[PDB]
Write an enzyme that holds these catalytic residues in place. Sequence first.
Site, mmCIF file in Angstrom:
data_model
loop_
_atom_site.group_PDB
_atom_site.id
_atom_site.type_symbol
_atom_site.label_atom_id
_atom_site.label_comp_id
_atom_site.label_asym_id
_atom_site.label_seq_id
_atom_site.Cartn_x
_atom_site.Cartn_y
_atom_site.Cartn_z
ATOM 1 N N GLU A 20 55.677 37.198 38.039
ATOM 2 C CA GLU A 20 56.522 36.763 37.063
ATOM 3 C C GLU A 20 55.928 36.516 35.779
ATOM 4 O OE1 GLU A 20 58.562 33.339 38.224
ATOM 5 O OE2 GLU A 20 60.288 33.702 36.901
ATOM 6 N N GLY A 70 52.889 37.751 34.242
ATOM 7 C CA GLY A 70 52.121 38.619 33.819
ATOM 8 C C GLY A 70 51.900 39.727 34.836
ATOM 9 N N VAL A 115 49.044 43.088 35.958
ATOM 10 C CA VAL A 115 47.676 43.663 35.993
ATOM 11 C C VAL A 115 47.580 44.974 35.818
ATOM 12 C CG1 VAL A 115 45.523 44.097 37.318
ATOM 13 C CG2 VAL A 115 46.893 41.824 37.656
ATOM 14 N N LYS A 161 44.341 41.741 33.054
ATOM 15 C CA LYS A 161 45.573 40.893 33.678
ATOM 16 C C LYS A 161 46.066 39.957 32.396
ATOM 17 C CE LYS A 161 44.765 38.600 37.276
ATOM 18 N NZ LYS A 161 44.322 37.422 38.340
ATOM 19 N N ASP A 209 40.817 31.407 50.370
ATOM 20 C CA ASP A 209 41.821 32.586 50.331
ATOM 21 C C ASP A 209 41.036 34.030 50.784
ATOM 22 O OD1 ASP A 209 44.333 33.634 50.914
ATOM 23 O OD2 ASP A 209 44.635 33.893 48.588
ATOM 24 N N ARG A 218 43.231 41.622 51.710
ATOM 25 C CA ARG A 218 44.034 41.725 50.377
ATOM 26 C C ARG A 218 43.253 41.232 49.178
ATOM 27 N NH1 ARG A 218 45.949 38.016 53.640
ATOM 28 N NH2 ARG A 218 45.744 35.888 52.570
ATOM 29 N N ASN A 219 42.099 40.245 49.301
ATOM 30 C CA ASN A 219 41.523 39.558 48.119
ATOM 31 C C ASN A 219 40.281 40.342 47.916
ATOM 32 O OD1 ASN A 219 43.650 38.109 47.297
ATOM 33 N ND2 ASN A 219 43.538 36.518 48.845
ATOM 34 N N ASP A 251 39.921 37.257 43.141
ATOM 35 C CA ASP A 251 40.799 36.110 43.402
ATOM 36 C C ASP A 251 40.169 34.729 43.393
ATOM 37 O OD1 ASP A 251 43.306 34.813 43.720
ATOM 38 O OD2 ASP A 251 43.550 35.343 45.863
HETATM 39 C C1 LIG Z 1 45.754 46.266 42.797
HETATM 40 C C2 LIG Z 1 44.795 47.335 42.182
HETATM 41 N N1 LIG Z 1 43.878 47.081 41.789
HETATM 42 C C3 LIG Z 1 42.975 47.988 41.545
HETATM 43 N N2 LIG Z 1 41.773 47.812 40.710
HETATM 44 C C4 LIG Z 1 41.623 46.610 40.366
HETATM 45 N N3 LIG Z 1 40.201 46.318 39.825
HETATM 46 C C5 LIG Z 1 40.366 44.934 39.152
HETATM 47 C C6 LIG Z 1 41.344 44.128 39.348
HETATM 48 C C7 LIG Z 1 41.491 42.895 39.218
HETATM 49 O O1 LIG Z 1 42.674 42.546 39.754
HETATM 50 N N4 LIG Z 1 40.704 42.548 38.188
HETATM 51 C C8 LIG Z 1 40.927 41.024 37.866
HETATM 52 C C9 LIG Z 1 41.424 40.801 36.534
HETATM 53 C C10 LIG Z 1 41.753 41.803 35.654
HETATM 54 C C11 LIG Z 1 41.631 39.465 35.952
HETATM 55 C C12 LIG Z 1 41.458 38.536 36.915
HETATM 56 C C13 LIG Z 1 40.671 38.813 37.971
HETATM 57 C C14 LIG Z 1 40.443 40.100 38.438
HETATM 58 CL CL1 LIG Z 1 39.892 40.163 40.183
HETATM 59 S S1 LIG Z 1 42.422 45.214 40.406
HETATM 60 C C15 LIG Z 1 43.514 49.343 41.764
HETATM 61 C C16 LIG Z 1 44.306 49.783 42.440
HETATM 62 N N5 LIG Z 1 44.852 51.085 42.684
HETATM 63 C C17 LIG Z 1 44.159 52.073 42.647
HETATM 64 C C18 LIG Z 1 44.287 52.970 44.040
HETATM 65 N N6 LIG Z 1 45.655 53.192 44.248
HETATM 66 C C19 LIG Z 1 45.824 54.054 45.477
HETATM 67 C C20 LIG Z 1 47.267 54.356 45.661
HETATM 68 O O2 LIG Z 1 47.784 53.165 46.695
HETATM 69 C C21 LIG Z 1 46.611 51.782 44.490
HETATM 70 C C22 LIG Z 1 46.445 51.100 43.068
HETATM 71 N N7 LIG Z 1 45.323 48.715 42.570
#
Ligand SMILES: Cc1nc(Nc2ncc(C(=O)Nc3c(C)cccc3Cl)s2)cc(N2CCN(CCO)CC2)n1
Length: 287
Positions: free
Chosen positions: A24, A26, A28, A44, A137, A141-142, A155
């Site tokens: 809600e 923000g 990513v 993010k 946590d 998922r994390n 996380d």
């Molecule tokens: C949810 C998600 N994240 C991905 N990569 C990430 N890298 C780093 C992330 C992260 O959040 N950094 C972060 C930030 C930025 C701030 C504070 C704290 C943190 Cl930890 S999220 C890839 C991904 N996909 C790729 C592959 N697809 C396959 C099809 O199904 C699906 C979607 N999906």
Amino acid sequence: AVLKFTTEIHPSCVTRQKVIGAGEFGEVYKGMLKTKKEVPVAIKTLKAGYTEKQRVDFLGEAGIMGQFSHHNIIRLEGVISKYKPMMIITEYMENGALDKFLREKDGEFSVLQLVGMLRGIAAGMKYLANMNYVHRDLAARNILVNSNLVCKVSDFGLSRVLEDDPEATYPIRWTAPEAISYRKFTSASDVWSFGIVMWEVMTYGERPYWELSNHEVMKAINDGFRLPTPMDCPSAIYQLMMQCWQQERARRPKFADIVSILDKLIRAPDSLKTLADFDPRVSIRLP
Ligand SMILES: Cc1nc(Nc2ncc(C(=O)Nc3c(C)cccc3Cl)s2)cc(N2CCN(CCO)CC2)n1
């Protein structure tokens, strides 16, 4: 004080390209960072109108992550705080969240690859525990996965961690008994959660305890029941996860023990060919 360890990035160096997570207040994004050519990053954001608590929680995640330097902990590139919307920028994990990844790749990895993912998670968790950081946590998922199959703990924060996770309800089935019963969250309750993560990995993302309700899970655990062995699971791996689920906190391995055991199994990989018996739930007879 902790933010002074973070690099302040100018917005002109950041391009948001594709939404990969959303909430809600923000989103990513996958994007590019141009300080070398542009490098892929995750971004993010925190939308305008945020409260003081939201700002403290949001930048607090970056402040915590900036204190860590470990292969199995998501790396912080920097923050945008002088301009709005504010952003946190990290390395981009190409394969996303471990739970969804495994469910989309069911059966595609070797047992050695799966155990290697657990060793990486355990190494990150040992580092966090020794840095006096209790995750609270820990769950597939994390954990995030990159194109080298490296798993990294994600996380971070204080109250935002359990507040933002929809699995956390007023999640039970990843949480140690003492954390549920009297709010005692420690690295030893994280070890319990790690045992659940081991089961998630070895089952390719099966949901722990299936359709049991939260109350049914707690009652089962208190009565001594534990998750059954995954299919095709090394005996040593099932034994290790079981010991993570000791009711008595003091009997659980520390992450130091977990890392040591997993490292020894990987370095003598024939040890993983001995499988725990799988209790079949369906009987198929043929003359
Ligand atoms: C949810 C998600 N994240 C991905 N990569 C990430 N890298 C780093 C992330 C992260 O959040 N950094 C972060 C930030 C930025 C701030 C504070 C704290 C943190 Cl930890 S999220 C890839 C991904 N996909 C790729 C592959 N697809 C396959 C099809 O199904 C699906 C979607 N999906």
